Symmetry: D2
Subunit: 334 residues, 4 copies
């Protein structure tokens, strides 16, 4: 009944998509490929997690397989994705989570080994991009290689959809205050392509470029060219926040914005877009599976046409659960 | 001789204004009041600083006085500011740095003990407010009680002045990503008036309200009612950044904004407004005495009339040096 | 079963309340805190940066704090002798403010109708207990007792097993401790303990602690044989003890592992844990053990001189031991 | 200040040895090899430092050379250390700072390119190991490949020397509470050989093995087999502390220990072993060039034969200055 899934890469996204699949029970993980992490080490990395705690259940290495809650998973150690025998392991969909095979040409290598569909758990320069709750109904059975966009695009797009649908976004500029990530360094070190990103992550607020706001214009075509932004990386291990400053076409009193976001969080976007009026801080969203949670108290309006809206996101758990939800949606359309 | 100064409070601002006074030599500190920090403890707190390093000169306790670089300072321990005998110590100007006597009525208590003028090192609901380089020439000898605004207003106002003078700010919304402060808590604790501020400072990104952007409209009267904003407190010990999203009246290409800001930093705002095109991060501004440093590479434009401008500020050292600069300017007008 | 009142809604008071609402060992019926009003108590109990959102419901209703539908009377008294514990029905009181730790000061709660007081901190003169080590020495004549500190509850179960099997001739302890509420975010005033005022995020801070000396009161045979100190480091929770000790009988490191594992699997089950996994501090977040021996982290110089490592969630282990001590006291009435 | 030096690796040790060489003027850096960091990036990494601040001087790229304070430095980009043309660049001594060529066989590759002597800025399994102030007089001109031990061994050995010389160490066990390092990860990531070291550095206290205490037994042969220990990595960017628990041969009152350590710090170990009775914390040692600073107030004695001694070390700046001091000592004996 559940679609069988293969995961390429056991980095942060790969492990948390695997954890979301077992926690939610929406899909069945049957294979994992990682050429640099051996089976005994995969048991340790999956079982203990500094951010989300110990896995609830059992994890062990048995007969060359990773056995999670009694379910044996085939382990591959291939550097070339076209050589992974996904079909022999029974993996129908493959989550491409390494971050280095994000074009349709590179991600398509998984079809050579027998996968039926590939979900890139990152932005893609050319694959169709989806955000659950915003454009997932535009998915169709002819699309064999798709992208789930980024964690930041999944936070901004549901909020931008509600605001644009009700008031019309003339233009917007976004800032994301983002938790540290695996690409950063503990102390000042080499990052040849992005010099600021090499600076010590524990000591600094680091400005960074991000295509997340521009990507919202691809998922919501009416907002193409109307949004852009940037990021600041700060020394917190997890949970990030979006700050969208936008100009509205129709007048919107701040209480009217709260009303429409609250009603959207209770209907078609339930579990995707959250809403709170509580005095929350980032740790209150630790392991929260929403893509975006509107913080009513934190935002501020200058006038009825110019406002700053705040939305929280667990950049690890929200996104990993959306990858699983996208695959469950795809399976329902077969 | 140089103006003789009394400092009320030996907290973070009081100690760093004392440090800036002795390092710049622009004024002479002759008295310090603090009811909770005794003399031997003041020596220790002034000598060692986790953020700015050990004091460059000498500091010791001798015959009941705090002696800095051979200069003896009378120490008072009064809870009620109207009882501090400033005149008996020779203090002419008093820096009111406790944060709890910020109205002209409360700060005016220092005139009862013999002070001639009082400088509130914080925003005031009613005192005239100044930002060096923006409106300090509006100071006159009839003003006995004034405010130096906040560190954040001193960062935003010089940048907003240059942008408004050249292109005209129709409206703007600001976010400041701010380093932790003394009012925050190490672990979740009580903060009855501001619940989010009680949450653990090391673990969280904390939204906070700030009147800094609205205060720029008092310092630059043409911007009254055209700016507002909010803050996020993040776990860094020092150095903060302003993110101003504004709508411009005249078209401004991003290279034209860079040209205008660079010219201001090299001329009338030299030492107040800095400019950089380097790949900087927050630690690069540790102990930097500018009020604001425009980060050309970090900002982003959506179009010629809607842009996001970034400016760094050492929230401790920039502001403490501006308090001394303001007092030196006031003394020159006597 | 026993009805309890909590004095103070700081970190220990809230987490003792949270632990009490994880089982039915005790029932919280009253809370006193003159500085935190009812609506703020709802917020502070509901959201916790370290241990996550409370799993149940929490709301203010008719002037009472209602947790999982169970109402609690709220008092706002600065003087402990004035709290009306008896009128609320509180038989035992957890004295968690940290400022009424002598038997004279903690005894003020008996004036309001409480039968027994449990000081959730070390006391200069009250009998001190550590569950699993000397709780069987508790007697119905003791109306005011102390549950020692989180650090003493980590060291004492391990020191008991080591001393029982090999004999501790002498020991020196270091605890690498997570930040606490008494610390400061940036360099600020701490008149009595100057190093503790220095910015907690920026520094490793040495600190004095009577925890190792207190083990000698809990285990009388170790009186005068242990002392130590602490380093506060910038982590929000979870701490570790490092006990360097000289043993009377020779003990190979595998023999130490065997006796600690045996104690964890039987008589000290749920109090002293044992692991051979490649653990780090976050692996003990919200772990309710008092002490978890880290077999891989320790090191022996020889059969008589070793360094033993044990982890403790300084918030959750201790708060659960306060509740366990009260359940034990109730079984003895 | 006359031996010409080549530096292999421009990681944190390589950059800080280069900074110490120009700050002290004791040696002349003439060449640097790093195959992954190009010239323009070396300028940036050397100029800005999150921990120690901006370089005091000038640094530019000119005609393919890195020019520091007007001194041109030849830049090599060789992966194979036997192919670096040290002799052609005039480099007489080579600092091997990559951490991957620490045996005499591997470090000996620099002799193929014309270097006369090699100093491994890390522990070596077989090279002679030195600690300035403890055994540097045992260096002789027949030793072409030597090691300067580790930052932790340089902290413990000067203190252990004074304690052993005066009271005799029967046995000792050390714990070092260590700042984070470049080998750690920002979030839980792969560290196949040392699993605990892959866990998120910002979130955890991490136990780690270290041969530093055992290495003191090689630098002070009388202590061979009498010391061992372990480490805890904690989330601070720099500055570490040693905690030595030792049993003494002769009785020693804690005041006698303070007296002999203070005397050593004022005489033969001046600049190597420091001494303080102040209420210090780790940030008070930021950029401190001592190898070890005894903290009199932090330690504790159980009795006259069993004590815990505490000593601070700036793990970056102390050690980098000792590498330069060792090379200036070797140059003086040529």
């Amino acid at each position: 009944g559940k679609v069988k899934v293969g995961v390429n890469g056991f980095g942060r996204i790969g492990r948390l998509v695997t954890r979301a699949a077992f926690n939610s029970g929406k899909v069945d993980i049957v294979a994992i490929n990682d050429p640099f992490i051996d089976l005994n080490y995969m048991v340790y990395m999956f079982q203990y997690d500094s951010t989300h705690g110990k896995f609830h259940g059992t994890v062990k290495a048995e007969n060359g397989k990773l056995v999670i809650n009694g379910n044996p998973i085939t382990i591959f150690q291939e550097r070339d994705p076209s050589k992974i025998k996904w079909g022999d392991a029974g993996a129908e969909y493959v989550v491409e989570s390494t971050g280095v095979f994000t074009t349709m040409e590179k991600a398509g290598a998984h079809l050579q080994g027998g996968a039926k569909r590939v979900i890139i758990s990152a932005p893609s320069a050319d694959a169709p991009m989806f955000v659950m709750g915003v454009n997932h109904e535009k998915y169709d059975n002819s699309l064999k290689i798709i992208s789930n966009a980024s964690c930041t695009t999944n936070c901004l797009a549901p909020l931008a959809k509600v605001i644009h649908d009700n008031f019309g976004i003339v233009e917007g500029l976004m800032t994301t205050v983002h938790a540290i990530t695996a690409t950063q360094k503990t102390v000042d070190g080499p990052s040849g392509k992005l010099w600021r990103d090499g600076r010590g992550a524990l000591q600094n607020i680091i400005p960074a470029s991000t295509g997340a706001a521009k990507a919202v214009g691809k998922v919501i075509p009416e907002l193409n060219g109307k949004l852009t932004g940037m990021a600041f990386r700060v020394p917190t291990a997890n949970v990030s926040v979006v700050d969208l400053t936008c100009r509205l076409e129709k007048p919107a009193k701040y209480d009217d914005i709260k009303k429409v976001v609250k009603q959207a969080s209770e209907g078609p976007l339930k579990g995707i877009l959250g809403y709170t009026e509580h005095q929350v801080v980032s740790s209150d969203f630790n392991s929260d599976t929403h893509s975006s949670t509107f913080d009513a108290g934190a935002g501020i309006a200058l006038n009825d046409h110019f406002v700053k809206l705040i939305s929280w996101y667990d950049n690890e758990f929200g996104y990993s659960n959306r990858v699983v939800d996208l695959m469950a949606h795809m399976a329902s359309k077969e």
